[PDB]
Design a binder for this molecule. Structure first.
Ligand SMILES: [Zn+2]
Length: 252
């Protein structure tokens, strides 16, 4: 896209292949954020097109993430081209002060959840589910951080409407809605008790910002509360109609 904007390197994860896709994009960001936290700020932004990474060759990196073996050389099949197509309005998130690896893990996590989202929908439930696409972006045209590292930011599509938390990452149950609860339960059982997708939130059944727990506690960022988090979900969990429809064992 021709018009005056910022350039950026766009990373997309493929949970099917377990590999990272590398891309380029041009984007126009608003000077002022429309949201704040103690942790992060959110900025409205427009896509001025998505392209391939060829002009910005990755080279041989020693200490960055991800490693080359983790990268897919082919990029042809991806969501970004279409979802972040020229003209598209979206959200840009910025974390204050954590590390590179963890930024990528968030996006990895998101994709894994999105995937299980589709696995859930395959079983033809009354209400279908979707997790938002997310992406890592390297802001190249901006001068790098205090350390050598360039400026990193996460990105997702606009999420319009009344935002609702249905469960939490530590066993809270926050809505009478039964679908979100069933979905987390579903993920626990069908993963052979290896993972849960909790912290299910968003507008209706369009979800974002999830969190995964795993027994060993390894992976999926600092929000992974391991066996503890899994227990908390289970101790508060009451199976419902949708649990039942899916042949979900009442015992966890
Ligand atoms: Zn259940």
């Amino acid at each position: 896209s021709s018009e005056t904007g910022e350039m950026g390197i766009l990373w997309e994860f493929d949970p099917i292949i377990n590999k990272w896709i590398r891309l380029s994009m041009k984007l126009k960001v608003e000077r002022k954020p429309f949201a704040e936290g103690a942790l992060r700020e959110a900025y409205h932004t427009v896509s001025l097109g998505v392209g391939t990474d060829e002009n910005y060759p990755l080279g041989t990196t020693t200490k960055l993430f991800p490693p080359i073996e983790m990268i897919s050389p082919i990029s042809k099949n991806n969501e970004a081209m279409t979802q972040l197509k020229n003209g598209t309005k979206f959200v840009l998130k910025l974390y204050k002060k954590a590390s590179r690896e963890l930024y990528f893990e968030d996006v990895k996590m998101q994709m894994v959840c999105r995937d299980w989202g589709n696995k859930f929908n395959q079983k033809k439930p009354p209400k279908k589910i979707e997790f938002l696409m997310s992406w890592v972006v390297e802001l190249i045209d901006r001068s790098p951080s205090s350390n050598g590292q360039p400026i990193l930011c996460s990105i997702e599509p606009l999420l319009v409407g009344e935002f609702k938390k249905n469960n939490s990452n530590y066993g809270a149950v926050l809505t009478n809605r039964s679908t979100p609860q069933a979905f987390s339960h579903f993920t626990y059982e069908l993963s052979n008790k290896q993972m849960i997708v909790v912290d299910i939130q968003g507008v209706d059944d369009l979800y974002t910002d999830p969190q995964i727990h795993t027994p060993d506690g390894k992976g999926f960022g600092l929000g992974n509360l391991g066996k503890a988090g899994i227990n908390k979900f289970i101790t508060t969990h009451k199976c419902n109609a949708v649990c039942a429809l899916l042949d979900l064992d009442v015992k966890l």
